[PDB]
Amino acid sequence: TTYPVLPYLTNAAYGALSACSTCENPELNVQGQTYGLLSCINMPESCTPGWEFTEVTQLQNNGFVVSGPATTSGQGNFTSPYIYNDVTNYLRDEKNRPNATFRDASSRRLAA
Amino acid sequence: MNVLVPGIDGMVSAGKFEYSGCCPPDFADMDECTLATSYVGLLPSGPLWDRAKYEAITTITATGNCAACWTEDHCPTLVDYAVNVGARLASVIDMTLWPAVRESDPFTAVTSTADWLERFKWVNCFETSCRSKALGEITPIEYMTECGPVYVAINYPPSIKQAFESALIKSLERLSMGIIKNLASINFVIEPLKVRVVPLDTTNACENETLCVTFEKTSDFFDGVNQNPCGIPSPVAAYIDRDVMQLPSELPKYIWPGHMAAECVVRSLLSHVSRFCVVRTDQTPD
Amino acid sequence: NFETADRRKRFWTTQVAACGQSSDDCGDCARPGLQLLCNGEGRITIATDNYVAGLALNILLTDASKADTGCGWTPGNRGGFWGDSFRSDNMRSGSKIRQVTARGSMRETVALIRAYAIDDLKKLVAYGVAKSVDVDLTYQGSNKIDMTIMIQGVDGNESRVGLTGERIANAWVWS
Amino acid sequence: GNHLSVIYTNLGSCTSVTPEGVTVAFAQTTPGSVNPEPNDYASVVNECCFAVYVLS
């Protein structure tokens, strides 16, 4: 709720990075601090992580994408965000029992 | 034309530059909270450190001194020690390095005001029993006695003594740079003491037998000294009440240490003039 | 004087399950960390047991410097520790078991993981805490893979004479 | 237009002297009301291939 950056800017940055500017190889995962770094966005360090670790795990288990600062610095110092997991909000199946066939964005790209 | 402003060399024209922005951060920006959490970045990275480094939380206790906040599910790790080191450096710099720089300049000294005066070899002319006879029949801090005048040494309160000494140091520092002994420059030298010279004669003069001057108060408050690196100083009163201090009744109702100090400086400066006179006038707070 | 002449002491040591175990639908895992010991009237203290076992955890769970690639890494996560610039033993801290990549069938990848594990824990012998170490790996299917590490210690006071090798230095931790 | 949280790091001790006495207060007065709901993708993107869709 207290994200110090305008929302749609971060979403555009994530999409552009994965929009074939890095995904000419269908099997490349956009994660980590090397590949999933939204360099163009700069924000000051927050006084609290925002997403408590108890909540980060739940979001990842429910098919959401969570991002956080790329480097640890004192409060108020500028940093950049990066993406933890690349997931496609996919759970269950038409045939109702669950699986993780399309749990990763790379799976959709590879299937195509 | 331009508007002149007082200066050490007389009346000059002042100006300003354009902001550059290449100044290193000062003691003021040194914040305990930000510095403490900063050392979490000096630790290595891996599965044994990611979770601990992510959950770092810092809060300020009663008297500042940011301390780590242990929630109900804290997992002890070296990360707690790293934050502790952060608090240490922020504290030691404030206690150790900041006072050293603060006391190194006459325009910012706080605790070592008395020591600085001893560096200037300053001696007051109103406290020696064998004062110069030209200093007047009875000085403001002398009461007549059958065996000639006698002076009384005042024990000023702490706050007024600190402010008065600080003001004196500033004026003495300015005078050591050398000046041309004209009215405009002298007023600037002693202005920290909140005193202004003003001649009595208004006609042409230069032929009369004596030249007379008097001292006027420019304000009723010294500008105090601030310990912290940020914030304005706290003003203090420049006068002292005779009755409150329980001094002999023969003394004047109000005593101004700044005026006495300023009078000594000017008298020494213009000693070579053989027809210089001072006519002090009683002054009261508004 | 009294025969207890060895004055060397032991500092804090990371321990397994110090902060409990985290459970998930896949399995149960430990959460290593420091341990707090409490007296009868407060006065908490840290534990200093199983020195060598604690040291092994530090080596395994710490990423070492990543090899050059020609594309580069962000300055944040190049790996390693900045404090290695001062040590004079000509070694670097951490491990690299996490830098493996999927090569060929799964059997080849698992074999490569074992090679890195041996190449990292081998530093224990160099420091002198342990006299020999070996890791046995078993592959029994797609889902279940098990690793076991064996570390050999020594008693504090020598008792055997005529050893082919040498008595490991820094054995005052007696493990 | 319902997303803001201003960070103003001047107040408190600062080497770039904060103008002493000045304080800033931040508050909201009126929120947004209505968003569009276009439903004609079949017409404007008819049989055209796109790798990634981004929606702001």
Describe the structure.
The structure is cut from a larger assembly and holds two copies of chain A, one copy of chain B (286 residues) and one copy of chain C (175 residues). Chain A is α+β, with helices and mostly antiparallel strands. Chain A has four helices and four strands, in the order H-H-E-H-E-E-E-H. The radius of gyration of chain A is 15 Å and the shape is globular. The N and C termini of chain A lie far apart (36 Å). Chain B is α+β, with helices and mostly antiparallel strands and 286 residues long. In chain B, strands 7-8-13 form a three-stranded mixed beta sheet. In chain B, strands 1-2 form a two-stranded antiparallel sheet. The relative contact order of chain B is 0.11. Chain C has three helices and six strands, in the order ββββαααββ. Chain C has helices at 51-60, 106-121, 123-127, and strands at residues 21-23, 28-30, 36-39, 42-46, 132-139, 145-152. In chain C, a hairpin with a 5-residue loop joins strand 5 (132-139) and strand 6 (145-152). Chains B and C meet through loops of B and loops of C. Chain A: This is Tail sheath protein. Chain C: This is Putative structural protein.
Helix content of chain A: 25-40%
Strand order of the largest sheet of chain B: 7-8-13
Per the principal axes of the C-alpha atoms, what is the gross shape of chain B?
Answer: elongated
The secondary structure category of chain B is alpha+beta
State the end-to-end CA separation of chain A: 36 Å
Protein name (chain B): Structural protein
Protein name (chain D): Tail sheath protein
Organism (chain D): Agrobacterium phage 7-7-1
Organism (chain C): Agrobacterium phage 7-7-1
